[PDB]
Amino acid sequence: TITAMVYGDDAVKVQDKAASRFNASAEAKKANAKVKMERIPASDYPAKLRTAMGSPNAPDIFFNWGGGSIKAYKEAGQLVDLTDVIKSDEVLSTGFLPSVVAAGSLDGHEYGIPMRGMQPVLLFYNKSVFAEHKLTPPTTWDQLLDNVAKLKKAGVTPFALGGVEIWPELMWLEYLVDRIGGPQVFDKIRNGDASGWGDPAVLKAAQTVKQLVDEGAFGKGFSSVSYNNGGAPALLAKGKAGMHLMGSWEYSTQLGKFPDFAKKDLGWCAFPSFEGGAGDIRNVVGNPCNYWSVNARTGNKDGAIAFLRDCASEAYTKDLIDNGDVPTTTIAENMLDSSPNPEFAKFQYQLVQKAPNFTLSWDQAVDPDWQQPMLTEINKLFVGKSSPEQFVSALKGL
Amino acid sequence: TITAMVYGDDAVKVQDKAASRFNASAEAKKANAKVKMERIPASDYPAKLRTAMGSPNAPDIFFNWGGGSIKAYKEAGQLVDLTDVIKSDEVLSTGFLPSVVAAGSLDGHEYGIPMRGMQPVLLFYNKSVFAEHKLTPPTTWDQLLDNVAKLKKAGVTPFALGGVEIWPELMWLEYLVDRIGGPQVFDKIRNGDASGWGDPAVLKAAQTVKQLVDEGAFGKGFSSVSYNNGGAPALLAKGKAGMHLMGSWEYSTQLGKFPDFAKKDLGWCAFPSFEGGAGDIRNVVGNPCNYWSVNARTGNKDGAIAFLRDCASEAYTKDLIDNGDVPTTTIAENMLDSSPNPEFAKFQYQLVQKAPNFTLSWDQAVDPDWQQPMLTEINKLFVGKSSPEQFVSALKGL
Ligand SMILES: O[C@@H]1[C@@H](O)[C@H](O[C@@H]2CO[C@@H](O)[C@H](O)[C@H]2O)OC[C@H]1O
Ligand SMILES: O[C@@H]1[C@@H](O)[C@H](O[C@@H]2CO[C@@H](O)[C@H](O)[C@H]2O)OC[C@H]1O
Does this entry carry the keyword rRNA-binding (chains A, B) (predicted)? Predict the structure, then answer.
């Protein structure tokens, strides 16, 4: 039994389908192995995984985002270096976009096999709401503000926001810092320099966020709305909100929970430009993918590799596409017209392919011991407990 | 039953004696436990420990230096947080100097039990050589360079130096940066800002090292001379070198290897002051102690804790003292009269108690993913492959 610890949101249905398919397979018989999904709820996944990895019953494979989400496990000797496994296995070697495999590497060694869709953060919107108020998707920050003022007036919350998890608030900072100051601002911080939080682009992003909040862009009480229980996506699908800045898994989430809305009334656009900003507007922030990594303590390394091969298969790729995701397998590009929404799938594939920079979600990119302290300070910014200068000063002390 | 992975230099005799004592004690049968030392050679200890921690046979407790030597294991969920264990257990609670327990801590949580001596780096010297050439230990850098010239004139290598391991070279940089720029210089770097390598004090120290190498202060073969096999201590004991900059375990090393020399002819002094420097001249660098940490996977935590209480005992304290170490147990200071050299033991105790700052060895203090590449660059500086400027630029690139 290969245990696979996985992030248990609605998307886990794809991995459930894969465990079933693999378990019934001849490659499985061959390695005398079955996979068992250990589903861990989204809301406390990083802590639960850490506890499990220190336990006698640590998972044989586990779900991650690369970067800071594996750096400690790797430094602690807990991971199998997959570089040679991937190189010598024909299916693994040619199975994924090389850029996505690189995003699951550390120090030039590959530690992840891609296992969900590419996940850039996009601006989604309700096309009904817009049509009713003669709004158009904003190509600039000033137009985004115009849209906020009109929705406010019309009694519609401009943006849905899952304040509870705090990382949905972080998304605003991520795009703002990149648009304003380009990718080198966060690169410096991610590499460990806390002084880097002193960059003027960070302060400008933090002030811009405060203005949005103070001026009602997220309404009142977003700090009590959750993304993970479906609350924030439902605000959008019911036309209680006009827009929603979210990882591209939002489309899948909408399709499964509100299919009528997702089919007819869900729109999308890139995060807008910001006047005077130095960042290339083609840059994206989010998650290049999610990855399986393999525990160095595992007793059936070959069984686990066998299951990992399935991640490159036509059947796995089709299951992702049918879910609303755009997979990172080499065969996916040629299969996008099979998507529930081929225009969206194609918009999303090319947005990522054209991006000069793809910045990993900050709470997954920073060193693990910064992840929570950082989200704590972001929440204090959003609820107005910290001024933008206090926010900067707190982070400089990490 | 409890495996203990330990750094296997000559000092490991004290831990073998502890295992013998514990395994024969009533406390060990009470806790249903025995301990087995898994001795790992000094030269590749951090790598072998990392491989073992990722193995199905990971040790129940293991030797470390605190700081970066545990940061990854802690972040990876591999350690028991000892804070409450320590607080609840009378013997552990009052058994150690609180400053030493703090230096086994991360993020305010205690992960280490002290288990060797306090280990400031000191300048040792051969008193027979110094008497023959009418030298006195240097209190300033100018006196040190006068001593360098006179010892060269006498045909004696001025400093023994174990170039092979590289960290004995690092000691020179550590005290030179601290004396020149103060502890703030390395604090900046340790906390993860690689641009901190650009501080003028780093370049000045690197320049200073180069000058020492170029003028023959370490003679010509030092890159092939080992500390861990005894080669560097032997050069001092035999009077082939006049001085040796080393962690205070050098006293114990000498007493074990060259007892007549250690009894009669070994001198010690603090690292000298430095003209033009800004660092507090009392500051020290080295290891506050070594620690046991406990694997979060351990099946018999109570057996492990019973062995850890021995580290606070009078017997373990006396075994350290008799070895030539100065223990960090609360019972130790009034027992230093039992030391093979009470004068030195007291000197060392006071030097550490008076130091405004005690910087952890850099290769143990920095994040584990910087440790070997930093040592690689220190080596290139000492053997002349990198100029001071190239050394600074390479380290900036970490
Ligand atoms: O920390 C945050 C992650 O929790 C978030 O994770 C994504 C949530 O949706 C799942 O369907 C995706 O697989 C998963 O990657 O990404 C944002 C990050 O800030
Ligand atoms: O990385 C280096 C360590 O290997 C060195 O460790 C000391 C060696 O002597 C042993 O007797 C001590 O217990 C141990 O701490 O410390 C210096 C550091 O740079």
Answer: no
What count of other Cβ atoms lies within 10 Å of the Cβ of residue A353?
11
For B202, counting Cβ atoms within 10 Å of its Cβ (0-12 exposed, 13-18 middle, 19+ buried), the class is buried
Handedness of CA A253, A258, A264, A268 (dihedral sign): negative
Which of the 8 DSSP states describes residue A270? -
Written as one letter, the residue type at A127 is K
- Quick check: A376 contacting B, CB < 8 Å? no
Pocket test for ligand 1, best of A249, A257, A290, A371 (most atoms within 8 A of CB): A249
Rounded Cα distance between B360 and A2, Å, is 41
Task: Confirm if A2 and A300 have CB atoms less than 8 A apart.
Answer: yes
Q: Which residues of B touch A296 (CB under 8 A)?
A: 54-55
* CB-CB neighbors (< 8 A) of A77 in chain B: 49-55
Enter the tokens of residue A338: 């099979």
Chain A's closest residue to B398, CA to CA, is A191
- Ligand 1 neighbour A228 (Cβ under 6 A): no
The full 3-state SS of chain B, as one line of letters, equals: CEEEEEECCCCHHHHHHHHHHHHCCHHHHHCCCCEEEEEECHHHHHHHHHHHHCCCCCCCEEEECCCHHHHHHHHCCCECCCHHHHHHCHHHHCCECHHHHHCCEECCEECCEECCCCEEEEEEEEHHHHHHCCCCCCCEHHHHHHHHHHHHHCCCEEEECCCCCCHHHHHHHHHHHHHHHCCHHHHHHHCCCHHHHHCHHHHHHHHHHHHHHHCCCCCCCHHHCCCCCCHHHHHHHCCCEEEEEEECHHHHHHHHHCHHHHHHCEEEECCCECCCCCCCCCCEEEECCCEEEEECCCCCHHHHHHHHHHCCCHHHHHHHHHHCCCCCECCCHHHHHHCCCHHHHHHHHHHHHHCCCEEECHHHHCCHHHHHHHHHHHHHHHCCCCCHHHHHHHHHCC
Which residues' Cβ are closer than 6 Å to ligand 2? B 7, 9, 11, 116, 119, 167, 170, 247, 249, 287, 290, 361, 363-364
Which of B20, B13, B3 is closest to B310 using CA atoms?
Answer: B20
Question: Does A227 sit in the ligand 1 pocket, CB within 6 Å?
Answer: no
Rounded to the nearest angstrom, the minimum Cα separation between A184 and chain B is: 14
Partners of A286 in the beta sheet?
A120, A360
Helices (H) and strands (E) in chain A, counts: 21, 13
**Tokens matching residue B269:** 């002094």
Question: What is the enclosing helix (H) or strand (E) of A182?
Answer: none
- Phi/psi class of residue A7: alpha, beta or left (left: φ > 0; alpha: ψ in -120 to 50)? beta
DSSP-derived secondary structure letter, A304: H
Beta-carbon neighbour count of residue B57 at 10 Å?
8
Q: Which of A370, A10, A58 is nearest to A196 (CA)?
A: A370
CA distance B362 to B175: 11
Query: Which domains, from first to last, does chain A contain?
Result: 1-119+287-360 (3.40.190.10), 120-286+361-398 (3.40.190.10)
Query: Which ligand sits closest to the CA of B378?
Result: 2
CB contact under 8 A, B58 and A297: yes
CA distances from A227 to A120, A167, A199, A233 (A): 17, 10, 30, 7
Both tokens of A292, joined, read: 């399986």
Ligand nearest to the backbone CA of B362: 2
